[PDB]
Design an enzyme around this catalytic site. Sequence first.
Site, mmCIF file in Angstrom:
data_model
loop_
_atom_site.group_PDB
_atom_site.id
_atom_site.type_symbol
_atom_site.label_atom_id
_atom_site.label_comp_id
_atom_site.label_asym_id
_atom_site.label_seq_id
_atom_site.Cartn_x
_atom_site.Cartn_y
_atom_site.Cartn_z
ATOM 1 N N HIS A 147 21.108 24.363 55.149
ATOM 2 C CA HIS A 147 21.548 25.690 54.732
ATOM 3 C C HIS A 147 22.986 25.691 54.232
ATOM 4 O O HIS A 147 23.429 26.696 53.665
ATOM 5 C CB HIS A 147 21.356 26.702 55.875
ATOM 6 N N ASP A 166 16.233 21.983 58.856
ATOM 7 C CA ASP A 166 17.583 22.331 58.411
ATOM 8 C C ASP A 166 18.517 21.121 58.418
ATOM 9 O O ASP A 166 19.727 21.271 58.592
ATOM 10 C CB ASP A 166 18.172 23.459 59.271
ATOM 11 N N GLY A 189 30.997 28.230 60.295
ATOM 12 C CA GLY A 189 31.528 27.111 59.549
ATOM 13 C C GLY A 189 31.537 25.791 60.286
ATOM 14 O O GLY A 189 32.071 24.809 59.753
ATOM 15 N N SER A 228 28.540 24.436 61.572
ATOM 16 C CA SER A 228 27.249 23.769 61.481
ATOM 17 C C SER A 228 27.453 22.350 60.965
ATOM 18 O O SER A 228 28.353 22.079 60.164
ATOM 19 C CB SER A 228 26.290 24.542 60.570
HETATM 20 C C1 LIG Z 1 22.332 34.897 63.592
HETATM 21 C C2 LIG Z 1 22.917 33.559 63.048
HETATM 22 C C3 LIG Z 1 24.052 33.092 63.995
HETATM 23 C C4 LIG Z 1 23.502 33.804 61.623
HETATM 24 C C5 LIG Z 1 21.789 32.507 62.980
HETATM 25 N N1 LIG Z 1 21.225 32.325 64.292
HETATM 26 C C6 LIG Z 1 19.790 32.029 64.419
HETATM 27 O O1 LIG Z 1 19.078 32.024 63.467
HETATM 28 O O2 LIG Z 1 19.300 31.743 65.720
HETATM 29 C C7 LIG Z 1 17.924 31.490 65.828
HETATM 30 C C8 LIG Z 1 17.579 31.575 67.276
HETATM 31 C C9 LIG Z 1 17.999 30.237 67.841
HETATM 32 C C10 LIG Z 1 17.827 29.219 66.697
HETATM 33 C C11 LIG Z 1 17.619 30.058 65.414
HETATM 34 O O3 LIG Z 1 16.313 29.951 64.962
HETATM 35 C C12 LIG Z 1 16.163 30.094 63.555
HETATM 36 C C13 LIG Z 1 16.685 28.791 62.891
HETATM 37 C C14 LIG Z 1 17.608 28.863 61.926
HETATM 38 C C15 LIG Z 1 18.140 27.573 61.278
HETATM 39 F F1 LIG Z 1 19.437 27.394 61.650
HETATM 40 F F2 LIG Z 1 17.402 26.500 61.684
HETATM 41 C C16 LIG Z 1 18.116 27.644 59.747
HETATM 42 N N2 LIG Z 1 17.325 26.706 58.996
HETATM 43 C C17 LIG Z 1 17.324 26.778 57.485
HETATM 44 C C18 LIG Z 1 16.541 25.856 56.740
HETATM 45 C C19 LIG Z 1 16.541 25.920 55.338
HETATM 46 C C20 LIG Z 1 17.313 26.904 54.669
HETATM 47 C C21 LIG Z 1 18.087 27.815 55.408
HETATM 48 C C22 LIG Z 1 18.092 27.750 56.824
HETATM 49 N N3 LIG Z 1 18.943 28.741 57.616
HETATM 50 C C23 LIG Z 1 18.948 28.676 59.051
HETATM 51 O O4 LIG Z 1 19.712 29.582 59.868
HETATM 52 C C24 LIG Z 1 20.804 30.235 59.206
HETATM 53 C C25 LIG Z 1 22.037 29.390 59.177
HETATM 54 C C26 LIG Z 1 22.451 29.363 60.603
HETATM 55 C C27 LIG Z 1 23.939 29.335 60.901
HETATM 56 O O5 LIG Z 1 24.659 30.223 60.555
HETATM 57 N N4 LIG Z 1 24.445 28.186 61.695
HETATM 58 C C28 LIG Z 1 25.868 28.071 62.102
HETATM 59 C C29 LIG Z 1 27.011 27.989 61.073
HETATM 60 O O6 LIG Z 1 28.156 27.933 61.390
HETATM 61 N N5 LIG Z 1 26.639 27.967 59.665
HETATM 62 S S1 LIG Z 1 27.878 27.874 58.491
HETATM 63 O O7 LIG Z 1 28.624 26.617 58.607
HETATM 64 O O8 LIG Z 1 28.893 28.905 58.729
HETATM 65 C C30 LIG Z 1 27.152 28.085 56.838
HETATM 66 C C31 LIG Z 1 26.342 29.356 56.533
HETATM 67 C C32 LIG Z 1 28.010 27.538 55.693
HETATM 68 C C33 LIG Z 1 26.732 26.803 56.115
HETATM 69 C C34 LIG Z 1 26.129 27.216 63.346
HETATM 70 C C35 LIG Z 1 26.109 28.747 63.457
HETATM 71 C C36 LIG Z 1 27.461 29.457 63.670
HETATM 72 F F3 LIG Z 1 27.522 30.552 62.848
HETATM 73 F F4 LIG Z 1 27.534 29.836 64.987
HETATM 74 N N6 LIG Z 1 21.988 30.669 61.155
HETATM 75 C C37 LIG Z 1 21.203 31.371 60.084
HETATM 76 C C38 LIG Z 1 22.307 31.144 62.514
HETATM 77 O O9 LIG Z 1 22.948 30.451 63.242
#
Ligand SMILES: CC(C)(C)[C@@H]1NC(=O)O[C@@H]2CCC[C@H]2OC/C=C/C(F)(F)c2nc3ccccc3nc2O[C@@H]2C[C@@H](C(=O)N[C@]3(C(=O)NS(=O)(=O)C4(C)CC4)C[C@H]3C(F)F)N(C2)C1=O
Length: 159
Positions: free
Chosen positions: A38, A62, A118, A120
């Site tokens: 993502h 992911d 940010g 991940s």
């Molecule tokens: C509510 C919430 C916190 C926004 C959301 N929670 C949430 O969904 O929890 C449920 C319940 C427990 C597990 C999860 O099951 C669903 C699985 C989601 C996934 F992760 F497997 C995922 N697979 C994808 C595969 C293909 C394409 C897109 C995908 N999109 C995904 O999820 C999305 C992305 C992920 C995210 O934001 N991760 C972080 C991050 O920092 N990103 S980032 O660097 O800033 C950035 C956006 C620049 C890249 C670490 C967490 C931080 F913010 F703490 N999400 C949404 C969340 O965490």
Amino acid sequence: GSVVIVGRVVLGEVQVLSTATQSFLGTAVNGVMWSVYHGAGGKTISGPKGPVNQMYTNVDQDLVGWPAPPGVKSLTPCTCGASDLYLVTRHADVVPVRRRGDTRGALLSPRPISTLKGSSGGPLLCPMGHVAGLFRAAVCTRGVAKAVDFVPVESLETT
Ligand SMILES: CC(C)(C)[C@@H]1NC(=O)O[C@@H]2CCC[C@H]2OC/C=C/C(F)(F)c2nc3ccccc3nc2O[C@@H]2C[C@@H](C(=O)N[C@]3(C(=O)NS(=O)(=O)C4(C)CC4)C[C@H]3C(F)F)N(C2)C1=O
Ligand SMILES: [Zn+2]
């Protein structure tokens, strides 16, 4: 159109990765820099030696991976079975996590989601400094992170 290495977090070193609109982390294990789909999509990793294609791409999990760039040292996988882990954020914060399953870890004290945003692709580390997992998602309620979801290090293998 590519992912760029813009910084690092010194622990081993976690890579700070950025696209034109997003920034996140990358963790090298078993000769492979792993990150989250993502953030990086299917994009290549750029650099002076030219773009390099992803060698691993799993949309469902992911999880993406490139061959470790020259100089990017791989971290050691955790083999001690610890349940007391530490999430490393892009700001060099080290957040304690209690593992509650194969892909889940509870936070000892809730943290605002803005402080994990940010990070991940960052590692979850055991007390020995070994990588037990890779930060993927957060369990968020009322904008507060109470637990994290991560890719287990066992899934970070070459093939
Ligand atoms: C509510 C919430 C916190 C926004 C959301 N929670 C949430 O969904 O929890 C449920 C319940 C427990 C597990 C999860 O099951 C669903 C699985 C989601 C996934 F992760 F497997 C995922 N697979 C994808 C595969 C293909 C394409 C897109 C995908 N999109 C995904 O999820 C999305 C992305 C992920 C995210 O934001 N991760 C972080 C991050 O920092 N990103 S980032 O660097 O800033 C950035 C956006 C620049 C890249 C670490 C967490 C931080 F913010 F703490 N999400 C949404 C969340 O965490
Ligand atoms: Zn360990």
